[PDB]
Design a protein around this ligand. Structure first.
Ligand SMILES: CCc1ccc(C(=O)NCc2cnn(C)c2)s1
Ligand code: NI
Length: 341
């Protein structure tokens, strides 16, 4: 059963609704981005039209093996007609190929679905500035004031400086970065750049990165592990056991590992500043957890919503508990009363 918050009223459209079988009345299935909770249910045997970005479409074709005839890529920032309804895709500032969708209903209603997003003031000068939005389907992942984290720029600065210092002190140190999905590519690309190395990785991850339209990508990544001093591994292997085991496989080339685990928010953020972050260490292995977020902080979310002034908000995350729903509704009312809409 498809839940109400994945349906677009007055249309034959659903958003990120691939795990409910054939949805009654659905003429087009939109996919905001290539993350498993959102594409859950898509496969090579899917036979309905899928609307998405060019990058998302590359991944559907190459990773999930969806047939080309059912993939409908749309350009960003461009008015398009889909089954008689005007739509626009906007960059979501999430992972590569992630979009927000503007729907212009035949009756005059305007709906924005953010997908997953990290709100930014640059969105206030997109095609959103042009008109009123009546309903907002909002990524509420971190909709509570305790959720603070630094900018992506500050986090990258910390990681670059940390890696460069360690490897300059010890040329036989290896840097390892964890991953379990697309997104957060800047972490490992920025580190490899400062160290004058390509990033080494599995054939499967290399394949995924080749779908993302990153400029000069052939210059930045490789499957030849031996030529590389920045390696990518599955997030599950970023622990003392997993990393000891990996060091053994490198054949006495290295005698130290420095590893990074990009997480979302962690309770550590309430106490410590990014400058003061320290690793967990065991012998010749150190592990840094760094708060690189691709979702809005509470303050970023509040600013976007108070700017947009929607008439109704429909949360799409943390909808499963009454306590969550009650908390989110209280903040929406606070924001409205403070700003005056
Ligand atoms: C509470 C959230 C809303 C959903 C749609 C709204 C709206 O007013 N749309 C324009 C419009 C005017 N007349 N008709 C029929 C639609 S308000
Ligand atoms: Ni996501």
């Amino acid at each position: 059963t498809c839940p109400f918050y994945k349906k677009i009223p007055g249309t034959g459209f659903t958003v990120d609704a691939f795990q409910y079988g054939v949805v009654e009345g659905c003429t087009a299935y939109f996919l905001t981005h290539f993350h498993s909770d959102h594409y859950a249910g898509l496969s090579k045997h899917f036979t309905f039209p899928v609307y998405c970005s060019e990058i998302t479409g590359n991944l559907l074709k190459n990773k999930l093996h969806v047939q080309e005839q059912y993939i409908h890529p749309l350009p960003l920032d461009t008015e398009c007609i889909v089954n008689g309804v005007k739509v626009v895709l906007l960059d979501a500032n999430h992972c590569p190929g992630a979009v927000m969708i503007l729907f212009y209903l035949p009756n005059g209603t305007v709906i924005l679905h953010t997908g997953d997003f990290r709100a930014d003031p640059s969105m206030e000068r997109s095609l959103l500035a042009d008109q009123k939005v009546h309903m907002l389907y909002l990524d509420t992942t971190y909709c509570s004031p305790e959720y603070t984290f630094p900018s992506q720029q500050e986090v990258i600065r910390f990681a670059i400086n940390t890696a460069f210092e360690a490897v300059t002190l010890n040329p036989h140190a290896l840097v390892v970065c964890g991953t379990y999905s697309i997104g957060k590519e800047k972490v490992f690309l920025a580190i490899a750049d400062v160290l004058g190395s390509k990033v080494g990785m599995s054939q499967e991850k290399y394949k995924t990165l080749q779908c993302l339209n990153i400029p000069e990508i052939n210059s930045l990544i490789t499957t030849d592990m031996c030529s590389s001093l920045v390696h990518l591994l599955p997030m599950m292997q970023i622990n003392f056991k997993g990393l000891q085991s990996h060091l053994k496989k490198c054949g006495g080339k290295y005698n130290q590992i420095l590893a990074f685990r990009p997480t979302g928010w962690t309770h550590s953020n309430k106490f410590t500043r990014i400058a003061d972050v320290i690793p967990q260490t065991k012998g010749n292995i150190s592990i840094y957890g760094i708060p690189y977020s691709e979702h809005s902080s509470y303050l970023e979310m509040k600013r976007f919503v108070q700017w947009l002034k929607p008439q109704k908000i429909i949360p799409t995350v943390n909808v499963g508990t009454w306590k969550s729903r009650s908390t989110m509704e209280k903040y929406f009312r606070e924001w409205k009363l403070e700003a005056g809409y």
